[PDB]
């Protein structure tokens, strides 16, 4: 690395076999690949680390402690049943997390880091893993580096240092070799280009690069727990502590009654295992993993887990105009000169193929000096280049070059050679270079400048009319302004071009009409999302009329809408900015600092924002948003790294689905919480009243363990898996607090638990009317509680819908788990060893039917009160 850094580029190409302008032939590519290897360094453990990582959840430690407490008093079946419950919950958590991580890696593999490399001397699009040492690669603005790059030419190259060094300080690269951001001659793995263009050969790939150890370290860190995950860890711990208090009160009431110490210790350990939500963090992890799985199915790369839950709370979606709502395909269509003569331009694309026609006949070369001067100001000025009908740099600069190569003025791009340049910045809104003719070296250098029309007409001094140069006046500014407004209101992006001998001595030449089509599928999407209670906006760097027209064609702009500029948005303080910002749907002439200020102004109001943008201007605002979204086909790698979400199919129907699934996660969680809490309170109050009543306890410790498997295992994880509904999608977005245990939900939980307890007490007292103690009554109440539990599970399947209107075919896992619990209960009734270990004997068919109806009662009452609430809503 350093030895090649102090080595000259010619000596570098002498040490390693390469051609400087023609790249490597594919035979030599395969020859270097057979020895050096691929770009991926070795391999990136699920069998051992991922399975053992689930056992450090605190509720899992406490259930393991209860199991080893049961081991200390040596009952085998209690300990193995607690361990079976623990094994099942960590198994489903591990398999869902593993599947989500594998699908995430598959989708991140599906998009490759693309490279613009000249393998055969022509511009080709290759991947990062296809690169071999010796290949020379062109670097674009906002491109991640393909390999360890040694650059032979660099007119203007800028390399960030935040990837490895961790510093946000800007850094530049020097073409001349340096003896001995350590060395600016050699480009580093992991960095990205923030500005400018350069070309360079590569010295090594894969393991042989020094900077692979930083990537090895960055893979080591685990994903931190989401605020939802910590919140429901708190909820599970507080439910555990409330159940512990209730069970301790039961044990004291039990001690006074004097019931056997060992049997009540088993019943209390069983009740503690049951009522604790061992499956609450596992069901939260299952919901998040399934949400990531759906995002992969919706073609979205989600880097971190909290994005899946913050998309459900989203109520404002900001965006950009080019690259997000318009496809960032730019082409010059109309030319208006400073003379007043107008030209219309032919063709679509970044092509050399088009016609420019004035007054009814075509113009080319140096036929008319105004349009030729405008076109020439559109080739030398652009840093970007067009090679083999492919766009390399930014899409607007290419449009003018496409126009420059349309009119027949390609070679002046090369003839002119620049010395010092003024780079384009989003805050600066203007571009400028001074270059000198190759053939006419005696002629002095002259500056060319392209930028926002207001800044351009501010900077230049004079104008051109009738082929003559005259000083700019106010009426000339007025005619140029009305013309610019006409281009903007027609829907044509405006670039104003001017030329002059020196900066500040420039002269205005005219305008170019750049059109960009709206991205297909955005208008119906934005209509749907606005109909779903979100407020999608438009943050733009372009003019008022362009952004307003594009928002109108897209339907973003109402008939009475307010649009605020950048100077006005930095004029207002934050509170009245927050007041005026929901009315605004079009922001324009906004710098990235303005975009960050809009994002923060909506963030102060409690509104969860989701910036969907593309650009290299400043991706810190994408980190400032609650959700960072970037596009895949036309998306620069800096905003892809900064994004919290990447969509590769580039339709606004997916960000729409992300909010839908983030909403449905909480509904599935509500189903789990309702079901488990209702049966936990039912069993707890059952044991509390009977132990207090002096009656024999209706359920045994093994029976409460089987009830725990029902209440926390796959019958409850099924309710955490249940697919979303379209009607609960149409509900407006919720606040940041989850607000899960609502008053209606707690009322429903108490109603279901009260019906379960009353039915169990009725059957228990009915079998105790003859005042004898037999296992018949305790298996009667065990079967009654188990059937009540599956009926309360079926009642918990949908919060706002009736149990019949949804259907059992929606959730296959619920049907499988219900059938499994029914068959396990019937084996407890029928199998004589299971009869001995559960203190159970067989029952009759009519008794089972009577229990089935008595437990259907809670489902009937549940659908009655849900229909009553729905009719009250109507």
């Amino acid at each position, epitope marked *: 690395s350093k030895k090649a850094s102090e080595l000259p580029v010619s000596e570098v190409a002498s040490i390693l076999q390469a051609d400087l302008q023609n790249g490597l032939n594919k035979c030599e590519v395969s020859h270097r690949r057979a020895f050096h290897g691929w770009n991926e360094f070795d391999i990136s453990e699920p069998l051992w680390k991922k399975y053992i990582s689930q056992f450090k959840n605190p509720l899992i430690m406490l259930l393991l402690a209860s199991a080893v407490i049961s081991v200390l008093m040596h009952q085998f079946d209690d300990a193995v049943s607690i361990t079976v419950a623990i094994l099942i919950v960590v198994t489903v958590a591990f398999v869902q997390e593993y599947r989500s991580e594998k699908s995430l890696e598959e989708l991140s593999k599906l998009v490759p880091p693309e490279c613009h490399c000249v393998r055969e001397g022509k511009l080709e699009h290759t991947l990062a893993r296809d690169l071999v040492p010796g290949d020379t690669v062109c670097l674009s603005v906002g491109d991640r580096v393909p390999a360890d790059l040694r650059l032979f030419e660099a007119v203007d190259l800028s390399i960030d240092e935040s990837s490895l060094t961790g510093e946000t300080t800007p850094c530049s690269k020097v073409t001349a070799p340096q003896p001995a951001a350590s060395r600016s001659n050699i480009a580093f793995m992991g960095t990205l280009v923030r500005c400018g263009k350069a070309k360079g050969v590569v010295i090594g790939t894969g393991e042989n690069s020094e900077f692979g150890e930083v990537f090895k370290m960055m893979q080591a860190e685990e994903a931190p727990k989401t605020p939802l995950q910590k919140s429901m860890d708190l909820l599970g711990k507080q439910l555990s502590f409330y159940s512990f208090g209730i069970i301790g009160i039961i044990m004291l009431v039990g001690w006074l009654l004097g019931k056997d110490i060992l049997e009540m210790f088993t019943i209390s350990v069983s009740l503690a295992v049951a009522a604790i939500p061992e499956g609450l963090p596992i069901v939260v992890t299952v919901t998040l993993a399934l949400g990531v799985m759906r995002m992969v199915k919706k073609r979205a790369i989600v880097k971190k887990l909290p994005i899946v839950e913050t998309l459900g709370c989203c109520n404002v979606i900001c965006s950009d105009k080019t690259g997000t709502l318009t496809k960032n395909e730019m082409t010059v269509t109309h030319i208006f000169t400073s003379d007043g003569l107008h030209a219309e331009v032919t063709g*679509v694309g970044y092509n050399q193929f088009g016609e420019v026609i004035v007054d009814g006949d075509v113009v080319h070369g140096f036929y008319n000096p105004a349009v030729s001067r405008i076109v020439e100001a559109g080739c030398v000025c652009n840093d970007a280049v067009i090679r083999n009908n*492919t766009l390399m740099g930014k899409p607007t600069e290419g449009a003018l070059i496409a126009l420059a190569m349309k009119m027949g003025l390609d070679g002046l791009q090369q003839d002119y050679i620049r010395k010092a340049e003024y780079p384009f910045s989003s805050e600066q809104k203007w571009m400028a270079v001074k270059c000198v003719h190759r053939t006419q070296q005696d002629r002095p250098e002259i500056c060319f400048m392209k930028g926002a029309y207001e800044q351009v007409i501010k900077y230049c001094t004079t104008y051109q009319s009738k082929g003559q140069t005259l000083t700019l006046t106010q009426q000339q500014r007025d005619v140029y302004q009305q013309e610019k407004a006409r281009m903007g209101s027609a829907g044509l992006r405006v670039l104003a071009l001017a030329s002059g001998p020196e900066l500040g001595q420039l002269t205005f030449l005219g305008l170019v009409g750049i059109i960009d089509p709206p991205r297909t599928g955005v208008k119906e999407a934005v209509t749907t999302l606005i109909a779903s209670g979100v407020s999608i906006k438009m943050i733009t760097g372009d003019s008022q009329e362009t952004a307003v027209a594009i928002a109108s064609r897209l339907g973003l702009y109402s008939k009475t809408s307010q649009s605020v500029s950048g100077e006005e948005i930095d004029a207002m303080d934050v509170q009245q900015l927050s007041q005026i910002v929901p009315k605004v749907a079009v922001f324009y002439r906004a710098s990235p600092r303005h975009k960050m200020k809009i994002i923060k102004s909506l963030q102060k109001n409690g509104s969860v924002v989701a910036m969907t943008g593309d650009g290299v201007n400043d991706a810190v605002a994408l980190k400032a948003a609650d959700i960072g979204v970037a596009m895949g086909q036309t998306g620069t790698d800096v905003c892809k790294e900064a994004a919290d979400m990447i969509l590769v199919d580039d339709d606004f129907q997916t960000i729409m689905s992300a909010i839908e699934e983030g909403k449905g996660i909480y509904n599935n969680i509500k189903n789990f919480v309702r079901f488990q809490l209702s049966t936990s309170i039912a069993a707890l109050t059952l044991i509390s009243l009977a132990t207090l009543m002096n009656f024999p306890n209706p359920l045994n410790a093994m029976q409460i363990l089987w009830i725990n498997i029902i209440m926390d295992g796959p019958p409850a994880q099924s309710l955490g898996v249940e697919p979303v509904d379209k009607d609960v999608i149409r509900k407006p977005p919720r606040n940041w607090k989850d607000s899960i245990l609502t008053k209606n939900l707690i009322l429903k939980i108490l109603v279901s638990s009260i019906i379960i307890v009353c039915g169990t007490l009725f059957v228990f007292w009915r079998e105790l009317r003859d005042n004898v103690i037999t296992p018949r009554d305790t298996t009667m109440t065990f079967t009654c509680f188990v059937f009540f539990d599956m009926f309360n599970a079926l009642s918990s399947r949908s919060q706002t819908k009736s149990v019949f209107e949804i259907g059992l075919c929606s959730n296959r896992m619920f049907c499988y788990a219900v059938l499994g619990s029914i068959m396990g209960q019937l084996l407890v009734i029928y199998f004589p060893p299971l009869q001995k270990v559960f203190q159970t004997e067989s029952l009759s068919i009519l008794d089972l039917l009577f229990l089935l109806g008595l437990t259907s009662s809670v489902c009937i009452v549940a659908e009655i009160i849900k229909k009553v609430e729905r009719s009250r809503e109507k």
Partner: nanobody, 121 residues
Framework: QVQLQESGGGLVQAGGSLRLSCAASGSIFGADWMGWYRQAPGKEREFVAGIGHGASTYYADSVKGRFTISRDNAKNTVYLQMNSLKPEDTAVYYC???????????????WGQGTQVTVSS
């Protein structure tokens, strides 16, 4: 307005011969440019045939000579003749016809839906 429907198109192997045909409902003598634009599967859009007001037929660099254009006025259906295309040169072939507007800065460029050409085997 011009509504564009493409006829005689569909995927063909490398080395084959076929005649494209694009039907335009509107006039051609008032139009500025009758053009054919390619859209490669997975890549950007270029063109394959184009004739404008200046009577200069445009042939792309990949298909110079072997892709040819012919058209008349009354039939309102411009053709495109291609010979021996390449697998990298496959595309969904669009249609584009616009008029000459300087009062109205309107997008008179209308695209057709086109037809897809891809070489795999």
């Amino acid at each position: 307005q011009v509504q564009l429907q493409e006829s005689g198109g569909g995927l063909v192997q490398a080395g084959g011969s076929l005649r494209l045909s694009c039907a335009a409902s509107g006039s051609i003598f008032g139009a500025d440019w009758m053009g054919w634009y390619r859209q490669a599967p997975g890549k950007e859009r270029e063109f394959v045939a184009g004739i404008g007001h200046g009577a200069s037929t445009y042939y792309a660099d990949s298909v110079k000579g072997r892709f040819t254009i012919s058209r008349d006025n009354a039939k309102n259906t411009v053709y495109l003749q291609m010979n021996s295309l390449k697998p990298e040169d496959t595309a969904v072939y669009y249609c584009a016809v616009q008029y000459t507007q300087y009062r109205s800065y309107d997008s008179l460029l209308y695209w057709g839906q086109g037809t897809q050409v891809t070489v795999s085997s």
